[PDB]
């Protein structure tokens, strides 16, 4: 179960990278 | 004639010498002459480990394994007296040489089996009245299998036999009894058996070659668990000399 | 445009969401192989005979490690500096036993990171920037080279490379202190000045710029909205920042020049860290820390301990205990 | 202050000296396994991260400057009282966005973050050392010890580090803690083969 | 370009002085690290065999031979940690070398006093030492004023090769920026990125 | 990017919140015994 | 009592996950324009 | 504590006779020892053979006895194994093998006496540290 | 394992060739300012 | 019931004297005249049924015989212990300084 | 391995609860009027 948790957390983080990069709020010059 | 630079890193250095197919002669034994093996070499080609019986208590079989310690397995440059006995049988009494190798093989499913593949202090004898060593000659005998680790070896928690802690120091107040087998290291000493089957003899040079099969116990990790039964098969080479 | 021309146009395109570029062309596959091999090994790799003494060390989660203890174990001392790609092994099972994942990962990694650096130059060139961000990046890269390649080279084995793991990292460190007295080495000390100082100036800079933000917002909203991406006017008052810090110490100890300041900000951690790296890389060839063991002697000749000797005692504990089964002879000569 | 106050005496505080401070480091390893402590790890992240930000920010600014002078040496081409930004936030943001995938777009956030990271790191580390005052360590992983205790083939870098720690303690303690009157006979000193 | 090349050459020289004992003879420069580790093994193999040990059949604590074992390709090599250095070659060791590596009979019968002497000298002049030149391992006491020339030359050239690589990067990137005309910074009225489409 | 016109706002009113929390908590109170077994 | 040691996490996630889904929806609902 | 005339007084021979070394002879002894012997015998142990040390008691039980100036000087001219049975000049530095251990070539009899005196005096100062090895560092 | 070896070798050579011919492909010209650097 | 055999051996004469059958060869430095020649011959010709049997090693000189005799009070014999004599450990037991 | 049997629930709630708090806040932020 420990392992499940660890790998899970990691996977959540990579997914987070993915959203944080491709689905970020875009920077806009005002 | 090959040099080290010709040989290095090829794997050939872990191989025993072969004799070509024309070598099917006979090497005469003068029962008045003393003899030696100047070099005994053993090259294993297959390691088989006996599966632990499920509990059916039928015949557990020897199953194949994959060698993981690379070409580091051969015994070579072994020497000893070759006695001629009163009944005309020959007895090899191993004196010295590179007569052991630690080896780890891996079973189906991943279990790793370390063993000390060895013929240390080998005493092997032929059938009686071998007036010549021929492709019909065989050697049979037994050898010693000391602990795969010697007495200084420390387990990963600093516990050892001739050195090290004697308890589970990471568990200062754990009850010792359940851990005794792990805290108290034991040094194994068991017997193995080997048959050498001569397949080739060069009568002029005194060189013999053939196949071997040995049976011995694997590592028991200084008494922590049960050893497995191992059967080792391969080819061998020996040069016989009057001495 | 022909196909090759179009391809070149895509590769070096400044409009790609992540820049590829020619450095990226090498970087991407190597970093992918490395990442994937690492991840898979970290989860599932079997124990590895790190010290070539048929005493396998478990690095992977499934074989009983957690995140802190887990590692990818360095390749076998039996291999040394021999190149051990998968195809030199008789089987994957053997490859795994002798620690092939370590060599595959770190070599791909080093290649990939070198290309990452090149890639920073390349893109800086594509966007019409000055080019030296990659020079800033050379410090951690050099350190990575120091610990994954140069130290192994000097000692003659990748088994002495830093394990790819947290606890393994600590191991590498303790053993390094033991064998080189790295703490007593001025290059490591320069490294330390580098990261501590880096942190200091980072916090400092943060605090002064944050301290001098021009009021553009109300108290019920974040001051961050007081800055709009791409505005021409600076968002804080450097004259006020300098006025503060210059009185905190003294005027001439303060920067009124933003460019000079940011150059200092770049240079200090970077130069220091270059020195950390050179520290590892020269102790790689066993030019070690200062040795003041028994430097102090009384009139008769009694040894008078200093703190250096206590360090020495600790170092000894480390020396004698590490890799408890690997040594047969009294000196650890590499 | 807090640490020695949790220990027997000021004796075990750091002494004010270069090498002495190093001893303090090695003591904490051997005795506290302080590296294994997640508060120290957060400390590490904050210090190294702060240095990273320092370097990366300085370099980014220095490599996205507007040409504001004819001089090839660019420092004079700045005036403290000037209204305009000295470097291009827009170009820097695109650069890192295409290189690394994300980028600051807000300078105020960037600099607050530059404050936050090292300050928070040191704070976490302070908390961990507060734990060490009481010897309330991250010394062991219990699952690890139970497994290694029953299984002498089980080895991790963790167990190896404990061997190092055990060595540190036995070899350094007599001279490091002279008030204890430690006498450790040759035969009790933990040593591997040969060394 | 020249900075890059000299950097490359520097690293090559570092490894040259570290490993090679032909154009850097150990008689003048001292033993290589490998030479010396191997020399330790030779020394004690010799000692213990003199004491009556059978060094071929001597099993170490690990299961590996205390003095002699096989390389991953089967060559007979000194054992223990010095296993990593089995690629070492030196005039004092090679006479003990046979087709399959170290020859047990030559070891038993053919080791000459000049080899024992050489092995002892090299073992005790291993390329280890402090920055203030205290010879030996980092925990060794003051006594011996020694740092191997191999270490001085290897380290000096690593530091130099590295900074020259840095210089290479600095000047190649600057040559690029200057050639393209923005080594002094971005044109405010012509900021290239401002004419580029947004990324998202 | 040109915006997607199929987008719709989503709603859950308070009564619906209370209803949902009631459902979930009471279901949990029911099944918990079995999860603990 | 010898309970299933996963019952705790099971129940907890069973309650929390959908409750939270509902809380997200309610709160983003309240914040829409009146 | 001081380096007194008494400390520098060590056995000349096996017959109860002593010699008092000067401070300058002791210093010369350290210098020459470092120059010629310390490469293996740093701190009084022996790196190429740790079983044998330079402890005074150990020198006392060697054959012939080496716990005096004369014994050590003779050793430095014509070294033997610990039992006196074989001459080891061929693998150990001596005046006899100055051809193969070139560092022994400029060593004079005075130098030998001084080195010897270092070997006997050092344990009187350093105690268990001399010949103790790393345990006692 | 020989097939793996040949595969990797081909792959590597491929990417390396892309790198080299790529930088040979008028790289000095690929910038937003002065392109005539020949 | 598991026993550490080396520790157990320490409670025999092995812990009190030089055991001609088990003790590592370096122990012979303790006494005048034993090392290395006689030490080597002794280890090489082990095991011994009684201490005095050491006088029966072939090739000995009268000098060697007398040294041995003067040193018999320092020798003992106990059963050969595999743990102490394997690995050539009698010649090098992994202990230096 | 003999792990702490609550390590699972501890970790899970440690991740989920603040993650959920943040998601609630984000989502109610997006739905406010532009
Ligand atoms: C444009 C550039 C192109 C780059 C593109 C990438 C393509 C791949 C490059 C390969 C990288 C090197 C990996 C192996 C390193 C090695 O094990 O290096 C060691 C080798 C020599 O190795 C040793 O060489 C010895 C040879 O001596 C033998 O022969 C001697 C004769 O006297 C003696 O007999 C001796 O005893 C005997 O052993 C032995 O064989 C050793 O086993 C063997 O490992 O050196 C060498 O090949 C020569 C020097 C190699 C470079 C040194 C590495 C430094 C690079 C990183 C720098 C940091 C970057 C910072 C960025 C910011
Ligand atoms: C912001 C703040 C940042 C803070 C970090 C700052 C980084 C630098 C800090 C380090 C300062 C060094 C203090 C000097 C210590 C000392 O006095 O060190 C003393 C040593 C000599 O020490 C002596 O070395 C001797 C060695 O003995 C050996 O040799 C003897 C014979 O000489 C005998 O034979 C003896 O038996 C044998 O053991 C003894 O050990 C003595 O006890 C011992 O005092 O000085 C020497 O070695 C001289 C040769 C080496 C000196 C090199 C200096 C370091 C340069 C790094 C900075 C890079 C800058 C680059 C510029 C671009
Ligand atoms: C990558 C490796 C790494 C890193 C980045 C760190 C970094 C960190 N560790 Mg360290 N550590 C490491 C490895 C590492 N460690 C290792 C391997 C060990 C061995 C296990 C230790 C053991 C260790 C210990 C034992 C301790 C740390 C501490 C800390 C922190 C130091 C904070 C500081 O700067 O205090 C520096 C001091 C201050 C900020 C106090 C204020 C200083 C004032 C302002 C000075 C004013 C000077 C004045 C002007 C006069 C100067 C005069 C001049 C002549 C000198 C920090 C988080 C410490 C810690 O955790 O702190 C809580 C700590 O106690 N570490
Ligand atoms: C502080 C500055 C510094 C210093 C003092 C040194 C010092 C030294 N370096 Mg150098 N080095 C430096 C910086 C420095 N380096 C830098 C910045 C780099 C680039 C990173 C290098 C790269 C480098 C390399 C690559 C090498 C050295 C080497 C050496 C050494 C020998 C130099 C040599 O022989 O040149 C060669 C001399 C010339 C090119 C001049 C012409 C010589 C002529 C051709 C000689 C003809 C001789 C012939 C027998 C004539 C006989 C006549 C006949 C007809 C009778 C020497 C110790 C060598 C070494 O020992 O490294 C381990 C070596 O291989 N260095
Ligand atoms: C009881 C008694 C009698 C009471 C009597 C008191 C009486 C009134 C006292 C009066 C007399 C008194 C003066 C006598 C003095 C006594 C004595 C000298 C006290 C000494 C105290 C103390 C130990 C002195 C330490 C010296 C000093 C503090 C060392 C630290 C300073 C340090 C070296 C500065 C240099 C480093 C420099 C590179 C820092 C810049 C990098 C970093 C800050 C960049 C960040 C940054 C900088 C900017 O610049 C701006 C702009 C911005 C944006 C910005 O990001
Ligand atoms: C199979 C699986 C399980 C593998 C897992 C095994 C492996 C070990 C996983 C690792 C596990 C884990 C990650 C270990 C570490 C855990 C732990 C120590 C983390 C500590 C937590 C944290 C709270 C510590 C407290 C202190 C503090 C918050 C540290 C934060 C560090 C922070 C992220 C520093 C920033 C570094 C990051 C690279 C910044 C990027 C910014 C970048 C865009 C700047 C570029 C830039 C520069 C400019 O100048 C300008 C102008 C612009 C515009 C611009 O963009
Ligand atoms: C007794 C010893 C014998 C002597 C031996 C000599 C040894 C060699 C010494 C090395 C010389 C260094 C030259 C520095 C020049 C320079 O940087 O100019 C660039 C600018 C110019 O200054 C700026 O100068 C500008 C004018 S101009 O550019 O100079 O024209 C001006 O506009 C601006 O306000 C001003 O700040 O310098 C600065 O930005 C501020 C100084 C920052 C310090 C630079 C050092 C790098 C960091 C230290 C390294 C870390 C070490 C610690 C490890 C952690
Ligand atoms: C001249 C000596 C150079 C030494 C090594 C380089 C140090 C500075 C480079 C750090 C890179 C950080 C990220 C790049 C950041 C980067 O982009 O820099 C940008 C900065 C400004 O660029 P400029 O265009 O204005 O000037 C550079 C050239 O174009 C020439 O004008 O360039 C420099 O300042 C170089 C200064 C050389 C003079 C500095 C000497 C200071 C170091 C002295 C050594 C002390 C060490 C002792 C230790 C105890
Ligand atoms: C070749 C391409 C290489 C791509 C590799 C993948 C890179 C991924 C980079 C991190 C993505 C996640 C960032 C989320 C957050 C996010 O979306 O960042 C976006 C953010 C943008 O800030 P803005 O200025 O745009 O917004 C300011 C306003 O929103 C004020 O709130 O960037 C920063 O804050 C920089 C500081 C944090 C950067 C931290 C980087 C840490 C790296 C890894 C650390 C964890 C390691 C775990 C490993 C298991
Ligand atoms: C509401 C505040 C909460 C702070 C508590 C955190 C203690 C940290 C120890 C001291 C470090 C101080 C460094 C701050 C440096 C500082 O100057 O802060 C200042 C800053 C407020 O400053 P300002 O009002 O000027 O606004 C700054 C912003 O505009 C950003 O630019 O405080 C924070 O940002 C509040 C949020 C921090 C939250 C920290 C992370 C908390 C996560 C805890 C995880 C719990 C897990 C629960 C599982 C169920
Ligand atoms: C005396 C010696 C000898 C010999 C030597 C040899 C003969 C060598 C050579 C010659 C040569 C043959 C060398 C080299 C190489 C070269 C180089 C180093 C090149 C480089 C490359 C690059 C750099 C390019 C760049 C880039 C590309 C990649 C792409 C596109 C762009 C460009 C073009 C920019 C021996 C070893 C036997 C022994 C010892 C001594
Ligand atoms: O492998 Mn990892 O650590 Ca470099 O030193 Mn020698 O080897 Mn082992 O001992 Mn110490
Ligand atoms: Ca037959
Ligand atoms: Cl270790
Ligand atoms: Cl070794
Ligand atoms: Cl002793
Ligand atoms: Fe800034």
Short mmCIF file of C-alpha atoms and ligand atoms in Angstrom, two decimals, chain C residues 326-333, chain D residues 194, chain E residues 37 40-41 66 78-83, ligand 15:
data_model
loop_
_atom_site.label_atom_id
_atom_site.label_comp_id
_atom_site.label_asym_id
_atom_site.label_seq_id
_atom_site.Cartn_x
_atom_site.Cartn_y
_atom_site.Cartn_z
CA UNK C 326 34.66 -4.73 0.75
CA UNK C 327 38.16 -4.30 2.19
CA UNK C 328 40.74 -7.03 2.63
CA UNK C 329 43.75 -4.78 2.98
CA UNK C 330 44.48 -2.02 5.56
CA UNK C 331 44.40 0.96 3.20
CA UNK C 332 41.58 2.27 1.20
CA UNK C 333 43.65 3.56 -1.77
CA UNK D 194 40.61 -4.43 7.08
CA UNK E 37 45.58 -0.15 -5.07
CA UNK E 40 48.50 -2.96 -1.90
CA UNK E 41 46.94 -6.19 -3.05
CA UNK E 66 40.63 -12.73 -0.31
CA UNK E 78 43.48 -9.13 -7.36
CA UNK E 79 40.42 -9.24 -5.16
CA UNK E 80 38.62 -6.97 -2.76
CA UNK E 81 37.93 -3.42 -3.85
CA UNK E 82 41.01 -3.35 -6.01
CA UNK E 83 38.82 -5.42 -8.37
CL1 LIG L 15 41.11 -4.27 -1.58
#
